mmCIF file of C-alpha atoms in Angstrom:
data_model
loop_
_atom_site.group_PDB
_atom_site.id
_atom_site.type_symbol
_atom_site.label_atom_id
_atom_site.label_comp_id
_atom_site.label_asym_id
_atom_site.label_seq_id
_atom_site.Cartn_x
_atom_site.Cartn_y
_atom_site.Cartn_z
ATOM 1 C CA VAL A 1 -0.039 -0.001 0.049
ATOM 2 C CA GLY A 2 3.076 2.342 0.237
ATOM 3 C CA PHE A 3 4.453 2.448 -3.321
ATOM 4 C CA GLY A 4 3.756 4.353 -6.302
ATOM 5 C CA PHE A 5 2.580 1.878 -8.952
ATOM 6 C CA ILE A 6 2.743 3.463 -12.457
ATOM 7 C CA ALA A 7 1.801 1.360 -15.636
ATOM 8 C CA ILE A 8 3.881 1.256 -18.928
ATOM 9 C CA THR A 9 3.659 -0.858 -22.009
ATOM 10 C CA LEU A 10 5.994 -3.109 -24.031
ATOM 11 C CA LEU A 11 5.228 -5.015 -27.086
ATOM 12 C CA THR A 12 6.618 -8.383 -28.477
ATOM 13 C CA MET A 13 6.165 -9.028 -32.144
ATOM 14 C CA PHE A 14 7.455 -12.691 -32.530
ATOM 15 C CA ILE A 15 7.515 -12.596 -36.267
ATOM 16 C CA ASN A 16 7.602 -16.280 -37.336
ATOM 17 C CA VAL A 17 9.491 -15.959 -40.538
ATOM 18 C CA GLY A 18 11.518 -18.934 -41.535
ATOM 19 C CA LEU A 19 8.728 -21.193 -42.498
ATOM 20 C CA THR A 20 9.116 -22.838 -45.848
ATOM 21 C CA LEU A 21 12.677 -22.978 -46.951
ATOM 22 C CA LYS A 22 11.917 -26.540 -48.261
ATOM 23 C CA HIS A 23 14.644 -26.609 -51.087
ATOM 24 C CA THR A 24 11.721 -27.869 -53.207
ATOM 25 C CA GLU A 25 13.223 -30.313 -55.925
ATOM 26 C CA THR A 26 16.931 -30.465 -56.944
ATOM 27 C CA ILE A 27 17.313 -31.516 -60.584
ATOM 28 C CA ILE A 28 20.082 -32.526 -62.800
ATOM 29 C CA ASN A 29 20.494 -34.062 -66.221
ATOM 30 C CA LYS A 30 23.461 -35.824 -67.927
ATOM 31 C CA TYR A 31 25.247 -34.632 -71.126
ATOM 32 C CA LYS A 32 26.873 -36.687 -73.833
ATOM 33 C CA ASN A 33 28.920 -33.659 -74.866
ATOM 34 C CA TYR A 34 31.537 -32.837 -77.724
ATOM 35 C CA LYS A 35 35.219 -32.184 -77.339
ATOM 36 C CA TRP A 36 37.617 -32.121 -80.351
ATOM 37 C CA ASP A 37 39.081 -35.339 -78.876
ATOM 38 C CA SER A 38 35.920 -37.487 -79.956
ATOM 39 C CA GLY A 39 37.010 -40.606 -81.878
ATOM 40 C CA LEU A 40 35.144 -43.505 -83.262
ATOM 41 C CA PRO A 41 31.314 -43.608 -82.628
ATOM 42 C CA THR A 42 29.435 -46.968 -82.502
ATOM 43 C CA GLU A 43 26.887 -46.722 -85.176
ATOM 44 C CA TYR A 44 24.537 -43.921 -85.006
ATOM 45 C CA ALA A 45 20.927 -43.046 -84.069
ATOM 46 C CA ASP A 46 18.558 -40.119 -85.118
ATOM 47 C CA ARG A 47 20.817 -37.499 -86.424
ATOM 48 C CA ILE A 48 18.244 -35.740 -88.766
ATOM 49 C CA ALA A 49 14.777 -35.781 -90.340
ATOM 50 C CA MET B 1 50.461 -22.075 -100.398
ATOM 51 C CA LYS B 2 48.316 -24.451 -102.367
ATOM 52 C CA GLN B 3 48.615 -27.249 -99.536
ATOM 53 C CA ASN B 4 45.324 -27.585 -97.625
ATOM 54 C CA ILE B 5 43.164 -30.398 -96.331
ATOM 55 C CA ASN B 6 39.272 -30.245 -96.577
ATOM 56 C CA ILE B 7 38.112 -32.462 -93.688
ATOM 57 C CA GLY B 8 36.640 -35.695 -94.192
ATOM 58 C CA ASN B 9 33.214 -37.047 -95.442
ATOM 59 C CA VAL B 10 31.365 -33.782 -96.672
ATOM 60 C CA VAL B 11 27.602 -34.839 -96.847
ATOM 61 C CA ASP B 12 24.964 -36.819 -95.132
ATOM 62 C CA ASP B 13 24.287 -39.799 -92.711
ATOM 63 C CA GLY B 14 26.769 -42.415 -93.731
ATOM 64 C CA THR B 15 29.203 -44.273 -91.604
ATOM 65 C CA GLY B 16 32.143 -42.354 -93.169
ATOM 66 C CA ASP B 17 33.435 -39.157 -91.536
ATOM 67 C CA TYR B 18 36.549 -38.141 -89.681
ATOM 68 C CA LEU B 19 36.850 -39.760 -86.299
ATOM 69 C CA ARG B 20 36.717 -36.248 -84.731
ATOM 70 C CA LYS B 21 40.241 -36.510 -85.872
ATOM 71 C CA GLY B 22 39.710 -33.896 -88.471
ATOM 72 C CA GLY B 23 40.314 -30.945 -86.236
ATOM 73 C CA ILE B 24 43.898 -31.992 -86.281
ATOM 74 C CA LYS B 25 43.504 -31.316 -90.008
ATOM 75 C CA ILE B 26 41.545 -28.043 -89.589
ATOM 76 C CA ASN B 27 44.267 -27.319 -87.058
ATOM 77 C CA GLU B 28 46.977 -27.367 -89.581
ATOM 78 C CA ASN B 29 45.283 -25.007 -92.110
ATOM 79 C CA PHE B 30 45.127 -22.055 -89.890
ATOM 80 C CA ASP B 31 48.679 -22.872 -88.926
ATOM 81 C CA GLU B 32 50.033 -22.971 -92.525
ATOM 82 C CA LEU B 33 48.103 -20.006 -93.730
ATOM 83 C CA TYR B 34 49.093 -18.087 -90.621
ATOM 84 C CA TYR B 35 52.580 -19.039 -91.522
ATOM 85 C CA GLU B 36 51.592 -17.381 -94.664
ATOM 86 C CA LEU B 37 52.459 -13.904 -93.270
ATOM 87 C CA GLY B 38 54.439 -14.997 -90.185
ATOM 88 C CA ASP B 39 54.216 -11.441 -88.852
ATOM 89 C CA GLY B 40 53.224 -9.848 -91.817
ATOM 90 C CA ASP B 41 50.293 -7.519 -92.316
ATOM 91 C CA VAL B 42 50.284 -5.561 -95.514
ATOM 92 C CA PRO B 43 48.669 -2.099 -95.498
ATOM 93 C CA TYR B 44 48.128 -2.156 -99.367
ATOM 94 C CA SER B 45 44.910 -3.926 -99.398
ATOM 95 C CA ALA B 46 43.601 -1.555 -96.454
ATOM 96 C CA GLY B 47 46.584 0.590 -96.886
ATOM 97 C CA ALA B 48 44.785 4.122 -96.431
ATOM 98 C CA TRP B 49 42.083 2.630 -94.111
ATOM 99 C CA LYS B 50 43.654 3.541 -90.816
ATOM 100 C CA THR B 51 45.199 6.748 -89.776
ATOM 101 C CA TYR B 52 42.142 9.060 -90.315
ATOM 102 C CA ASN B 53 42.133 9.469 -86.432
ATOM 103 C CA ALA B 54 43.650 12.417 -84.845
ATOM 104 C CA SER B 55 47.497 12.593 -84.359
ATOM 105 C CA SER B 56 47.463 8.900 -84.628
ATOM 106 C CA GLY B 57 50.332 7.129 -83.163
ATOM 107 C CA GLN B 58 49.169 4.507 -85.686
ATOM 108 C CA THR B 59 51.356 1.596 -84.779
ATOM 109 C CA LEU B 60 51.547 -0.704 -87.713
ATOM 110 C CA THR B 61 54.746 -2.165 -85.946
ATOM 111 C CA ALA B 62 56.342 -5.614 -85.934
ATOM 112 C CA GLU B 63 54.491 -6.256 -88.691
ATOM 113 C CA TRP B 64 51.398 -4.406 -90.109
ATOM 114 C CA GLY B 65 50.565 -1.656 -92.796
ATOM 115 C CA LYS B 66 48.289 1.078 -91.633
ATOM 116 C CA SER B 67 47.719 4.474 -92.683
ATOM 117 C CA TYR B 68 46.591 7.358 -94.749
ATOM 118 C CA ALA B 69 45.877 10.342 -92.593
ATOM 119 C CA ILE B 70 43.445 10.642 -95.529
ATOM 120 C CA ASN B 71 41.527 13.890 -94.660
ATOM 121 C CA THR B 72 44.776 15.004 -92.978
ATOM 122 C CA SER B 73 44.608 17.624 -90.328
ATOM 123 C CA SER B 74 46.188 14.633 -88.732
ATOM 124 C CA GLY B 75 49.665 15.854 -87.833
ATOM 125 C CA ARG B 76 49.974 12.163 -88.070
#
């Protein structure tokens, strides 16, 4: 009963960001590629129409 | 220099063609016909082309031809 007792405010947001970040799908596809070394093929396929 | 190689089967599907090996050939051409003018660059074909620019140092050096200073003003 003997003390002053004043009221003041504080606010806490707690922003939740960091959901998702699920990396989705990772995708890679191989190549047959061409260098000047090259050399003998084994037969052929497709190649034009 | 009248010695140059035309690289292998020229046309269509085939089993004939050069082994990727060709480039070795196509490697040589650029060699030879670079050894044509080893350093050399004539102006004469372009001889008046270059210098038209102002006060041109116009290095043709070590080999090349360059210049006119065609319209002059050049103090070239």
